[PDB]
Amino acid sequence: MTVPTPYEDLLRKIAEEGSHKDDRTGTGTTSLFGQQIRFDLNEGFPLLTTKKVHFHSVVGELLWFLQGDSNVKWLQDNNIRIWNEWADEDGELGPVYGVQWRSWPTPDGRHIDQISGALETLRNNPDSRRNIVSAWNVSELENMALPPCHLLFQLYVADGKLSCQLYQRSADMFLGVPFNIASYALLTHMFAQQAGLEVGEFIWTGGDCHIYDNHKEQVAEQLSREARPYPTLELNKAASMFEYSFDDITVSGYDPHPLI
Amino acid sequence: MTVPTPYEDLLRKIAEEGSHKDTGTTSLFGQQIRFDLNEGFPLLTTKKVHFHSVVGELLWFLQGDSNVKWLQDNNIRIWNEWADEDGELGPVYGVQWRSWPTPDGRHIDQISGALETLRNNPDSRRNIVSAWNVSELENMALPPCHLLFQLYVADGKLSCQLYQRSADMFLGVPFNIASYALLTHMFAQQAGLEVGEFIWTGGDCHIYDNHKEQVAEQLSREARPYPTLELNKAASMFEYSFDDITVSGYDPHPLI
Structure with missing residues (x-):
């Protein structure tokens, strides 16, 4: 009942107060510098519900990070083209x-x-x-x-709960950021689980936080929508940080607003 | 117009809401302080902060030499x-x-x-x-x-954000704020830009039990307007001196 929307709030704030820059190479942005979004992971998995976020891509990119792989092969073979x-x-x-x-x-x-x-x-x-x-x-x-x-x-533990803060130097608020969030939220669930801890907060901290001009209308439409309760993460304990697999990781009760 | 107190605001929130840990601390994680540098240099007025100490550490960072000798000759023991x-x-x-x-x-x-x-x-x-x-x-x-x-420029204004993994709130952070605000002023001046914001972002932000009453007294005082930095343009980033860097209209409450 009024689901917290700290991501949408930042999006909204940048659109209203951001500074406009134009190249003019057709890559115009409005931006704010040094901003923060925090989620209480215990209150829901922060996969946005005001538009769809491709959780399968999130999951697989992280798994690939975790393997220490500089080759794009495993990604193309799981149809992640990023x-x-x-x-x-x-x-x-x-x-x-x-x-x-x-x-x-x-x-x-x-x-x-x-x-x-x-x-x-x-x-x-x-x-x-x-x-x-x-x-x-x-x-x-x-x-x-x-x-x-x-x-x-950076990781932190208080009262048996694991918190994580991310520093991200550049943030495409519409396309990139919802994916970053889901993905570090999941990382932190992976750490907590392997360390026998509970989950606290994920704090996302941004440098240059920008909305591309070419996303103006998509943002106004996302922003006109009411948030739905976040989904819940179903995470099966793999043997170690490096042995998770797509089958261990589902999200349930995911109910995103339709495109676009 | 009131005087912005984002450092004290966060000092108060941690004292109120942080969780106590055993040299015991009380902490919050992942917090953010921001100052508009055009509205005053953030050397605190709720207690005196020793500026010379800030200036010297910075001049020494900038010279790239990690021998302590030059700090010692300039009276910094830290x-x-x-x-x-x-x-x-x-x-x-x-x-x-x-x-x-x-x-x-x-x-x-x-x-x-x-x-x-x-x-x-x-x-x-x-x-x-x-x-x-x-x-x-x-x-x-x-x-x-x-x-x-990280540095960022918009509308001819330089901003700077710092990531600090560990923050001794009473004692260290007032030095850290003034230190980086000054650094951002130096960059801006050498690049012919104006100043925007200094944004300080902390990981583990703590108040030692040792400082409970030092903190409570600080928190009971009303802020005076911030001083203004006087920065005489050196010939480069690596050539500033003590004589180039003073503060004006600094009216702090007393040392704690």
């Missing part, structure tokens, strides 16, 4: 997202697995104030098809 | 406990800002990069500076707290 634009002829991206997550290179063999590291500190030292995972490796940036947008996150 | 017998910290903040190392033995000057991008590509969405070099953490005295920032 990265296709950026791949070189052999399907390679250079060491984007999951390569940094799983194997940030040391000068000397040479891999730091931030994800195992994060989970282990969850288990042994949940009070840690340095439980952070970063993809923003300044010296590896030149090798990536492009530098990471969702670039760093 | 890094002494972390120093080794040689006054060496390992490659903390400024070594990363000025020289994040690459595998071929070269290095990246993120500050000059960031200033370049302001001058030549102000709209970039990748104007980032990071000190969170995961493969270098082993060698630092201490992992960076204020660990990454």
Whole structure:
């Protein structure tokens, strides 16, 4: 009854107060800098209901991040086409997202697995104030098809509940952001579950938060709609952070407003 | 017009709503403070903040040298406990800002990069500076707290957002706010831009039990208007001095 809409509120605020920039290469935006959206994960899985979000794509991109794979193959073979634009002829991206997550290179063999590291500190030292995972490796940036947008996150535990905050440097509010949210919300459910914890909040923090001019009307229509209760995440405990699979991950009671 | 108190606002919310943890703390996670830099420099008026200390740490970050010696000669003791017998910290903040190392033995000057991008590509969405070099953490005295920032320009105004993973609310954060507000003023001045907002975003934001009454007293005081920064343009980012940087119309309540 009046479902919280912190994503739609930001969308709305940017449209009303954002600054307009125009290139003029036909890529006009209105934007705000340094904004935040928070969800209480216990009150529902934050897959938006004011338009449809393709959960299968969310799920599979995350799984692929988690494998440490710079090759787009497994994605194309599950009909996720998101990265296709950026791949070189052999399907390679250079060491984007999951390569940094799983194997940030040391000068000397040479891999730091931030994800195992994060989970282990969850288990042994949940009070840690340095439980952070970063993809923003300044010296590896030149090798990536492009530098990471969702670039760093931090874990936190209070009263047995796991919270996660994301720093995202650039946010296409209409197309990109609903996917980012679902996807880190799911990551945090994966951590909590493996660490034997409950879920707290997902906090999304944005740098340049922009609505493309070419999305003006789609935004006004999304914004004219009433939110429905969020769905609920059905997550089957895989053996480890790296052995989840599409079959473990469903959302139930998902009731999105129709296109467009 | 009232005086905006977003730092105190958050200080009060954590004291009221944070959860107590055992050196015990009370904390909230993922909080945001923002200042409009055109409306005053955010050096707090509800208690005196020692500016010289802020200025010096920053000038030292910017010089990229992680030896403590130059801080000591300028009367700042704040890094002494972390120093080794040689006054060496390992490659903390400024070594990363000025020289994040690459595998071929070269290095990246993120500050000059960031200033370049302001001058030549102000709209970039990748104007980032990071000190969170995961493969270098082993060698630092201490992992960076204020660990990454981003610059953004709109309507000829420079904004800056910082990500700080750990925030000693009573003691550290007032130094951190003034420190980055000043840094953003420096960037803006070297790039011929005006100032927009400084946006401080914290992870684990805490009040130590130790400070309960220091905090309560702070929270009982009425803010005076913020001072204004006086910034004499140096010849470059790396050439500012103490003499270039003062504050005017600073009317704080007393030290706590």
